[PDB]
């Protein structure tokens, strides 16, 4: 038997995984990072919008602080997030930027002077003072009133990921790629590591550690149309769910982006709309104003996506051999504006769409983008399965609720990596584990048996046809608009698809470098993941954040101010087991109210919200009058935790 | 923390270790072999006499079989061996040769014809039939009547070791050299591996396995004069003794060789005496006939060594700046006889003694050669500490008793490696282990602390002066002739030397590649080992095999037909704890009698020997008359065990 031991095992080499690996290595814990591919190729590298953090450096950032950021995040989540976690987040975000800055991340800087700026509420000019010069800049992104999205030109994710990966190399972390975690080792409700398959040799190896962290990214590829990389299939989520102990949180909370290139799904940054981009239909008609006379194509993403789907349903969509789409017209911004400010958008359309965005229109359509759902954890990042932690998009640390804020996901990866990294490091150093060879042997022989059975199956089903059918079902039934009747149809079919997936047969019989065999065990996992999203989408009879139930348009704060928890305790069952974790309003710093975007009074008000609201107004006013800083007031409304290391306040310009 | 896991951990890369490694790897057990130096440089490579095995191929081998070999071994052991183990041995020896033969070991072959041969009972000519041609040859060695010592010209150990090492490479065994086991990991009386120090980096690493085998060789370097390599310091033995659970068997049973080159200790093969070599004193007087008129310089080694020491004591020894020695005259054999039959002895004397053995006399003196003692095990090779096995010279499997047979030690290494290898393999595959990080951490941090303390000691003692003093004490008091008064003096001084060894201070402070630090922790181990030999030599008031007590000249079969068992249960004690394992005559296939060499009736007869002897004569005659093969008779006298794989009988020429 092959066994590898390390104090801290990290599954996932993206921003969250690598940063967490830094936190454990820097304090003497031997740590291994497992990854499907070279770590600096993770989906994190694709980020081009930026990272949200309240620095308050630039003119449009002036006045910004933890409180403002915190609020956008909570109201953005539609109150489905753990506000305490959101506080831990907003507070540490500033120092994540600065640390990355200290590590070489080439953040775009501010320079004294006036500049051409688009506010589309006034496409006026902005002035940056001299004392702001040389500090980290920010851009308008995510719809926040305060511009706090930091960026490194148009390759933010790229540079960020490279810095963290390089720190890992500097600290001597063990990066092992082309290695896939296919199962978690656990006994008596504690995680002891993972059974891993070497994608090249095909060897099944047991990786044991005192603590295991899953930072496997999103499960976006369970949809046919998605912005995600081809490696975001949620298997990380799956192996956690397959322990029968750990739980998945809000898997039905999937977020879509409105303007990905159709049909490839290659992202066309939000800056297109923000700078003036125009959405047109089959007739070339600018339709957003029709639906949103005020904000027009500058409405919140959530809205735009819905409108685009509505318009298409009204039969005004473009007919294409890959389906219906709409048009994105950026040409009206001028050629000089594109070749300098959107020089990267011009390359995307040429290389992949075969068009010049300054001369032609780009085919677009909303598609799956971010996964709010994930392995459920406490504020420390630990799952119900002791010793198993999760961070980043793969988790449901839950600071996103039902709508993650644009710019908050890459931010969360690094931040959670820092905070969970600490808690994880502490767990590993302090906990003492009892490793039984009998158990290691059970899990390793177990997966060897499984691989063998796959290679020997005489089943007649095709893994690809099964996989493709799954992504169609998800796209057609679990997208932007959902209704009970269709969800039931989807759940039923996904469950049937799951059963047939076990009668798959593959042509290639080898155990090493076998892409066909990879699909063989992955698709079944992807199906169990899809079932949690679909079935959870069916059972949640309300419309919250990204979850829109046509048959239940109003957000139900009475019966649904909770969190969906999925599990699969019985390996023989064919549908996920759902439970709910109620969000206690009494622990909220901000009581459930209007979110800012969309219809109004579109929510069944909960009576305890009102009571709590007063409690808030009361306590706030008494201290606010008694001469008290925003800090003391915050502590009085909702005290949160933070590792000692990140407890410090964030110095800002104008302090 | 650094942890390496394998199913089967082997400490020692000599014949016994490597062969055992083959046995576990060939059956799918991942196995690691740890060694101080490259495995093919082990002391095993030095063997030039040959390997004893009853093939019965050659003329002088004709008639040979398991029974004859078995008897030489038991009577040779002076009845201190486990006869059942000796049976397991003699039976498997033949197949060890043949397997090595199948592996390429270039065994010298037989060729039809007559040849010049020396029997010194008749220096006549020998004839090898045509049906013997091409089969494995044998030579006169070990004093056995039947010539059964197989050899590969004059580098038997060399070729044998290379074949086994190469098989290890072929099977993909993990050979990790410049790695030293400095402590054994154990909890609840079970061995889980070993704490290892990387001699190059200085890293302390924990090697965990389901089974650990110690095949570390002999502890000969605790003497000043020894044939052993500089790496035979018994640390393997020490780490076993330091667990407080495992026991050492007959550590006082040390064997000496009579003709090593003085003072280097470089061996001058027994073929010198056998071919005609003459022993002379300071006056050039051939003295052996004086003491042994019959056998003369052809008496058993045991005798020759004693005579040489007696003669020296009588003041007839040569005075040299390194002490007193005697002379070995091979010149009288002629120049042509040496340059063809002893061409290798001629090189030894020139390169190291600066003399031509065909023109001058070589300075000689008896010196420590083989260690019968070692980690005590059952017939399967397992120690009192479960999961810990031992094989080869490092063990006390006990087939040697108080006098190992010349040609039986390299034979035992490979044989035990095969048999213990099987039992070891079975243990590893079947047993299930519970590895607690708390324990691994205790032992690893424990040895790190120790190294650190060594490097920081302000002690003023010198490790080398302490080490050298130890080897003098052993040479002067625990050699060929021993008496109570002197042994008490030695024990007392060794115990004082041990205490001062803990106040050692070393100049070089680094933790990597530090030969001074190596001596720092090794010498203390060597001292605990010496104490077991010395103190066990003091408490055994009798003269048996290599153990000669002048004050107790007779072999006591009444009070000493037992085995010395040394332990060190309390880390605070300063002297080994001895106990005795009684040898049950009722389980002996051969009752205690005369050994063949030396004085006669020199043993306090045990009454149960006689009773048993009849039981033997009776049972033998009844079956011998009732028409029964030597096999059925053996089974009736003393049934022994053998792994299924080696249960087959040994086909011989003339069957
Ligand atoms: C898709 C996307 C997302 C995105 C974005 C643009 C695109 C095209 N732009 C963003 C932006 O401007 N601002 C922002 O805040 N977020 C943006 N996002 C979303 C964001 O990039 C993600 O939320 C974030 O990158 C998630 O980071 P995370 O560290 O969690 O994950 P990852 O980078 O995907 O890496 C996952 C790693 O896991 C390994 N893996 C996965 N499964 C396994 C298994 N089974 N075994 C072993 N390793 C596994 C992957 O190899 C990978 O390295
Ligand atoms: C010294 C000697 C012995 C000898 C002989 C000639 C000489 C000069 N000629 C012989 C002969 O002709 N016929 C015969 O039957 N025996 C003869 N012998 C004795 C024989 O060679 C030995 O009994 C035999 O070789 C012992 O084999 P074994 O496999 O037990 O041991 P080894 O070869 O010495 O190797 C020991 C290995 O252990 C490693 N080691 C030791 N301590 C440690 C620690 N603490 N940690 C890690 N590794 C360790 C050594 O590196 C070595 O590889
Ligand atoms: Na998530
Ligand atoms: Na021994």
XYZ file of C-alpha atoms in Angstrom, chain A residues 1 3 5 7 28 30 210 431-438 441, chain B residues 1 3 5 7 28 30 210 431-438 441:
32
model
C 0.000 0.000 0.000
C 0.769 6.068 2.040
C 1.793 11.639 5.363
C 0.485 17.444 8.878
C 6.305 24.479 10.584
C 4.572 19.906 6.663
C -4.060 15.543 10.970
C -5.239 17.794 17.356
C -3.841 14.295 17.796
C -4.894 11.579 15.379
C -5.193 7.807 15.572
C -4.401 6.333 12.133
C -5.528 2.728 11.733
C -4.031 0.774 8.829
C -7.183 -1.323 8.773
C -6.580 -0.306 3.754
C 7.017 16.265 11.229
C 6.858 10.502 8.340
C 5.313 4.723 5.633
C 4.379 -2.091 4.949
C 3.285 -6.907 -2.919
C 5.898 -1.963 -0.086
C 3.287 -2.796 10.141
C -1.385 -7.708 11.272
C -3.308 -4.450 11.545
C -1.670 -1.486 13.233
C -2.939 1.558 15.099
C -0.554 4.478 14.458
C -0.985 7.352 16.903
C 0.553 10.690 15.916
C 0.905 11.482 19.601
C 5.552 12.861 17.844
